[PDB]
């Protein structure tokens, strides 16, 4: 619970998530863009207006918030094994001579 470091009383507007995308992300895909999402057919020319929205939205993290809305840093370690020789092995402690 990274409450102390990432919480701004004003809010830390620098942490954000994507509210709307046309399709579910493919596994391990990375997607970074600012493109307007519409509901109507109008192109809308990239303005904040009916059927025009900015897709990223902030988490508004703020200290006086409950456990549910508090920063939680996540580290997803994965293990990749290929036909090439392995190079990341494990301390392998020993015995005295």
């Amino acid at each position: 619970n990274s409450n102390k470091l990432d919480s701004k009383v004003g809010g830390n507007y620098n942490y954000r998530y994507r509210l709307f995308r046309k399709s579910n992300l493919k596994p391990f895909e990375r997607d970074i863009s600012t493109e307007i999402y519409q509901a109507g057919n109008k192109p809308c020319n990239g303005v904040a207006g009916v059927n025009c929205y900015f897709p990223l939205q902030s988490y508004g993290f703020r200290p006086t918030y409950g456990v549910g809305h508090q920063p939680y840093r996540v580290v997803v370690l994965s293990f990749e094994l290929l036909h090439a020789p392995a190079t990341v092995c494990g301390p392998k402690k020993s015995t005295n001579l």
Partner: antibody
Framework: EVQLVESGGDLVQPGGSLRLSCAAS????????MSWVRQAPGKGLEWVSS???????FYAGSVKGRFTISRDNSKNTLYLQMNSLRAEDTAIYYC???????????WGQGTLVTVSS | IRMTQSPASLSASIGDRVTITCQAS??????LNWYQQKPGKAPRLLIY???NLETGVPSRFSGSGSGTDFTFTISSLQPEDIATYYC?????????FGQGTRLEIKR
């Protein structure tokens, strides 16, 4: 105008299968969040199902596996296939588009389902 | 969430100041919408997020809250204000509405 004629259903025996249809004026069904509320006569509105902008489906506890939701790109017409019905499902069903955080809404007039014997 | 609305029969004369209180069982932060359902006609969305009244509404309805307890206010009770108002939370997957507060007018 976001006006909805979500008009399908009138009634069946217990154990039947009805098919609702919703409809759409300014937007496309498959691009915006939509859901289906359920208002029993004289009772607080209860939430049955909800679709997302990428096909994610979420249901309610009482409708796990009897109800289905389905989205139709060709003619709008957000479809909700009611199956495995019973004698306590009688309620008014309203089609609903919810834009999640920026705030607008469509709740269409809604249709009556009285399913009985 | 066990949504709780405390006033169900509340009756004020023409042009009065009333208040509706919707209460929850956890922290829903600010994601609680206020609806207005006239008899027969489909519900309208009045205050999304608990702090933002939708444009085009008359400008009397105001709401403010955070975390569990929320409140809804009516600034000028025009005669054409008879309806039933609902509070909805839209970010916890078991979306549960509230009971409604049937408002009436006295003369």
């Amino acid at each position: 105008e976001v006006q909805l004629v979500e008009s399908g259903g009138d009634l069946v025996q217990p154990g039947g299968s009805l098919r609702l249809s919703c409809a759409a004026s300014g937007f496309i069904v498959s691009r915006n969040y939509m859901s289906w509320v359920r208002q029993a006569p004289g009772k607080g509105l209860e939430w049955v199902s909800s679709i997302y902008s990428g096909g994610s489906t979420f249901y309610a506890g009482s409708v796990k596996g009897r109800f289905t939701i389905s989205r139709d790109n060709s003619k709008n017409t957000l479809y909700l296939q009611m199956n495995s019905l019973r004698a306590e499902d009688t309620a008014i069903y309203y089609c609903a588009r919810d834009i999640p955080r920026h705030g607008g809404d469509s709740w269409g007039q809604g249709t009556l389902v009285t399913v009985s014997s | 969430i066990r949504m709780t609305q405390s006033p169900a029969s509340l009756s004020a004369s023409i042009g009065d100041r009333v208040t509706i209180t919707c209460q929850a069982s956890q922290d829903i932060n600010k994601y609680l919408n206020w609806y207005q359902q006239k008899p027969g006609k489909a519900p309208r969305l009045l205050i999304y997020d608990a702090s933002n009244l939708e444009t085009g509404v008359p400008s009397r309805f105001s709401g403010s809250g955070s975390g569990t307890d929320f409140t809804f206010t009516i600034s000028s009770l025009q005669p054409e204000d008879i309806a039933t108002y609902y509070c909805q939370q839209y970010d916890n997957l078991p979306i549960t509405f509230g009971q409604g507060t049937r408002l009436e007018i006295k003369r």
